[PDB]
Amino acid sequence: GPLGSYKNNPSLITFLCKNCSVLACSGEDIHVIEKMHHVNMTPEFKELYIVRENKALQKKCADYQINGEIICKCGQAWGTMMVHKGLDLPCLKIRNFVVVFKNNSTKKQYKKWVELPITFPNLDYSECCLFSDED
Ligand SMILES: [Zn+2]
């Protein structure tokens, strides 16, 4: 049975690949930016996703330089690889991922992180302005 308490913990939930369903990362293993942008500051995840050479995604004239479109092993557009002055911030899309609850044996498929009733942390990359070398 369930016999649980709360389910608003990103520790019980995890992200998977829609196409497949491989654990790419966990909610708790994710950071938020102004609760407006979802950036996955996971290094190990860099070995779970592959970027393909495509300009159909990234753009020159912009403020957020992208590398292309991130895709799982199978090749499922996990989202996109955003860059900030040379930073690495992979923006995944729940519309390409899945959410599996640990508390109870179930699998919920969302579209946006906003749909996630689970509360997330708040990590402001800007916090560090050291690396800042460019103008
Ligand atoms: Zn896959």
Curated annotation (Swiss-Prot):
Induction: By interferon (IFN) and TNF.
Entry superkingdom: Eukaryota
Ranges of residues in domain RLR CTR: 6-130
Tissues in which the UniProt entry reports expression: Widely expressed, at a low level. Expression is detected at slightly highest levels in placenta, pancreas and spleen and at barely levels in detectable brain, testis and lung.
Residues annotated as binding Zn(2+): 17, 20, 72, 74
PTM notes: Sumoylated. Sumoylation positively regulates its role in type I interferon induction and is enhanced by PIAS2-beta.
Subcellular location: Cytoplasm; Nucleus; Mitochondrion
Family: Belongs to the helicase family. RLR subfamily.
Function, as annotated: Innate immune receptor which acts as a cytoplasmic sensor of viral nucleic acids and plays a major role in sensing viral infection and in the activation of a cascade of antiviral responses including the induction of type I interferons and pro-inflammatory cytokines. Its ligands include mRNA lacking 2'-O-methylation at their 5' cap and long-dsRNA (>1 kb in length).
Known partners and oligomeric status: Monomer in the absence of ligands and homodimerizes in the presence of dsRNA ligands. Can assemble into helical or linear polymeric filaments on long dsRNA. Interacts with MAVS/IPS1. Interacts (via the CARD domains) with TKFC, the interaction is inhibited by viral infection. Interacts with PCBP2. Interacts with NLRC5. Interacts with PIAS2-beta. Interacts with DDX60. Interacts with ANKRD17. Interacts with IKBKE. Interacts with ATG5 and ATG12, either as ATG5 and ATG12 monomers or as ATG12-ATG5 conjugates. Interacts with ZCCHC3; leading to activate IFIH1/MDA5. Interacts with RNF123. (Microbial infection) Interacts with V protein of paramyxoviruses; these interactions prevent IFN-beta induction, and subsequent establishment of an antiviral state.
Note: In HIV-1 infected HeLa-CD4 cells, overexpression of IFIH1 results in a great increase in the level of secreted viral p24 protein.
Disease / disorder: Type 1 diabetes mellitus 19: A multifactorial disorder of glucose homeostasis that is characterized by susceptibility to ketoacidosis in the absence of insulin therapy. Clinical features are polydipsia, polyphagia and polyuria which result from hyperglycemia-induced osmotic diuresis and secondary thirst. These derangements result in long-term complications that affect the eyes, kidneys, nerves, and blood vessels. IFIH1 is the CADM-140 autoantigen, involved in clinically amyopathic dermatomyositis (CADM). This is a chronic inflammatory disorder that shows typical skin manifestations of dermatomyositis but has no or little evidence of clinical myositis. Anti-CADM-140 antibodies appear to be specific to dermatomyositis, especially CADM. Patients with anti-CADM-140 antibodies frequently develop life-threatening acute progressive interstitial lung disease (ILD).
Name this polypeptide is given: Interferon-induced helicase C domain-containing protein 1
Organism of provenance: Homo sapiens
Organism taxonomic ancestry: Eukaryota, Metazoa, Chordata, Craniata, Vertebrata
